[PDB]
Design a binder for these strands. Sequence first.
DNA 1: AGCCACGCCT
DNA 2: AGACTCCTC
DNA 3: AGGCGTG
DNA 4: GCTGAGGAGTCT
Length: 613
Amino acid sequence: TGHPYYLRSFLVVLKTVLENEDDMLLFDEQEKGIVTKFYQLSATGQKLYVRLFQRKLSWIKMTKLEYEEIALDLTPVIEELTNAGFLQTESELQELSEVLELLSAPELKSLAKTFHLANPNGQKQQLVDAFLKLAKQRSVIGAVILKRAKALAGQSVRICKGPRAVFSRILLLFSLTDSMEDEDAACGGQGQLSTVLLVNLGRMEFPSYTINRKTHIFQDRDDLIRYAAATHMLSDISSAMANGNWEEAKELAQCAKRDWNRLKNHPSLRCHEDLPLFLRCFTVGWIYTRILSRFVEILQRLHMYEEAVRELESLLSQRIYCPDSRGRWWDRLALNLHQHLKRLEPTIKCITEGLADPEVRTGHRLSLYQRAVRLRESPSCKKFKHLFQQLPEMAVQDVKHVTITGRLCVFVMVLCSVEELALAHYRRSGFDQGIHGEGSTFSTLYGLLLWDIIFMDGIPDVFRNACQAFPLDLCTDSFFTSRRPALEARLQLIHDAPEESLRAWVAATWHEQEGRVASLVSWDRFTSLQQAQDLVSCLGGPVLSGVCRHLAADFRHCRGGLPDLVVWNSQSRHFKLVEVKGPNDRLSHKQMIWLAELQKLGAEVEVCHVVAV
DNA sequence: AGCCACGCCT
DNA sequence: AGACTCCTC
DNA sequence: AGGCGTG
DNA sequence: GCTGAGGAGTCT
Ligand SMILES: [Ba+2]
């Protein structure tokens, strides 16, 4: 008797957001009215509204509307949605470009023929700009075009842009907790969730934690309307780039940059600057800063390197927004000055400042240092002794490299990946066991051993609503420092743990939490609780402790770069950590920091190159 | 941000 | 015939 | 070839 | 430049 998936999900979103008094203050009388109206619709009225909300926003031929599961003939249901002001019919179709756009090319040809002043053959787009130019001069004859255009097309519906705007803002709010933050996912229509969420959110069970908020993110309905606006803008720049429309992208960004400069001084911005970082990421300035970053990516594409340097120097001169992205920017600035603008003098100042900024970490930090040596250890450069200025010699210990071969075809051993091929070589190297997990092997172990500390009470504002799969500060520096004594304790305990405590603890979280959606944990990463326990037996306390300290101290900068593979031997307990390298992938900076660190914790690390044959 | 095929420089 | 757009899960 | 960078 | 896989229907 349950609702179809798309409905359950939609309703979950509605509930999750609205049961916060804070959040309700961001919707007026009129708007809440609409929300109630939705709940008043019949089931069939709801299923359909959601379907069409989940589709693209424009007119649709009533002939192209089939949903048997909803209702066998939809006329009643459409009437209802029209009565409610959720849907509008053809009678409100007045703008011409809309009538035409609705019509197909075969329909456009039939309309290019009965009208004499029109050329019958050509592309749909052509016939469009033609019929448009035709009506803009002799308006009166254009009125009878629109007349038949409508009559031809038949019956048509559209989602009403009024309420639509409300449900989006709601969906936008919901997305702050789970979505958007946990990667920038799919989302169709005009404002939506990730596929995962839309399909499953109804079924999903979450880690239990206590909602506790004490800080407003948005000042009023306006703040949230402005944030959404920038969000919409970024989404357009992002999309443009993905479609390779780099020029459109450039303009749109220039436009955005404009507005963000015009936007400073507004009273609301002082409030934002005061928000802790893990909340500051949901503010107009943050989104606008994000857009500036994309803007540097656009300039670079268009070989406008001086411009990109100017932009990067701008971004880097403020500490307010997106501080976590400083590494990427310092790194990018140095590459640009050194490689493209060939300006060696600044490249050093750049490198030096980057390395003096505590915000740069792991990969990017190493990358700067390496450029700095490549530079000091250069002739053209020797005209100086300023890279001699106390560079903390960050020499990375070296790592056993290994090469095997496999027949290329996707490889063959069955069609198989580069990783499974390696898993074979290790199987015949006396490691009967193996997981291909990359970061989630370690990550889910980190989750299992720290669950309760991760979903711990007492930190204001980190749980804002019912559908979180992590505390909002997880990827900030404040995650550790807020939970410092607790972590330091658990870490010490894990370090000292004999290999039955480790098995016990894992099982303790596993048995109570199995299934619960938690960003850190993949319940199917390990083929059973038993495998999870065998692995924690091989790695032992100290190794598990070290790995967790990093993942908890600085998840944002450490989440990436761990090896693809873990392999171990059941009876001997020997394990090895393997970073598989295809013919075309080499060691990233984050990868080399990780392998050094795992070596430091005393663990067999090995890079396995797979040559094609 | 990571993946990947490819290319420019040396 | 192949690119493109929209939709479902 | 090997190192470093782009799209 | 790619980022979901898969499919049906439309455009050039
Ligand atoms: Ba790899």
